[PDB]
Amino acid sequence: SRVLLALHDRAPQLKISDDRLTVVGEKGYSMVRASHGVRKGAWYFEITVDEMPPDTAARLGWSQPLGNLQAPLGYDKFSYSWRSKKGTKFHQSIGKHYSSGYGQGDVLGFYINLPEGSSEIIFYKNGVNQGVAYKDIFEGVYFPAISLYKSCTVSINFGPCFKYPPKDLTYRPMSDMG
Amino acid sequence: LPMPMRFRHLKKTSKEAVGVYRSPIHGRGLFCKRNIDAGEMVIEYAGIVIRSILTDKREKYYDSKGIGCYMFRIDDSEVVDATMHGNAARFINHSCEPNCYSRVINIDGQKHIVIFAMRKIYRGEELTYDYKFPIEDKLPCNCGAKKCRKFLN
């Protein structure tokens, strides 16, 4: 059925709402993946930062199944992330300059393209392209992925309707996987 | 007694019940200064509680500084790192015929490693437990017991 935050594929310390679309962090960085992942084509989803108290943060993006649930997204070779703090992008624990930061009330967009042509990961802030973050990524299945540092709160939207659908970007909503 | 009561009594009394002295097994050991009944808490293996994922980072750091690493795993998810902050429990030697055992207890949502007495232990005895090291390819054991397994690993 519908795409949701995964039932078991999640760090146990994260507090997931009953509807499985909202999650709150707990102490050190930890991660939850969606219930469905994609292998080919172009796909999109959104995450809204509901609340970002002082000294809390998020690293949001895409993860293969082996991505470590007890580490920030982007920690290892299995995922790619975008940090709320300073807009840094992370992969294999290397943080690089990417965009400006994002915070409470921001609606972030997450694009991936896996041609059956080069693979790409692109991040959006309230509908606006923040630039290509990663290109020619590792082959595999990628799941929408949330990692949180301390008690900030985010909500994921897999579609079909997005808050800020990007202009001239073709994709299927992650909800199509449902 | 509710575990948090037993645990409170432990923390309030362990300093006067045990002490560090030279050991005939090895180096310095932990010793009983007053009789302890079977099943009673002896001492906590105290230190900094870290997530399991942080052990590798810390081990490599300590290794680079030539520092002996003192970690006690709680479970798959957490470890007590007593390398830089800890207590006298660090001095408890291994024995192949120990008089204590370690168990994990839960207090107010936090896990603690506590050493318990296997039997009634008398004043002056050295306190020991089985380290349960996995078998390597070796650290000679000097516990002195007739049933000594000759190596810790």
Binding site: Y29, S93 | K11, I48, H85, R90
Partner: peptide, 19 residues
């Protein structure tokens, strides 16, 4: 070491895992 009387839960930083 440094003596402690009770366990301390390590307080990880945001950058705990970063290079």
């Amino acid at each position: 070491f440094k003596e402690l009387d009770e366990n301390v839960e390590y307080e990880e930083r945001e950058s705990e895992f970063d290079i």
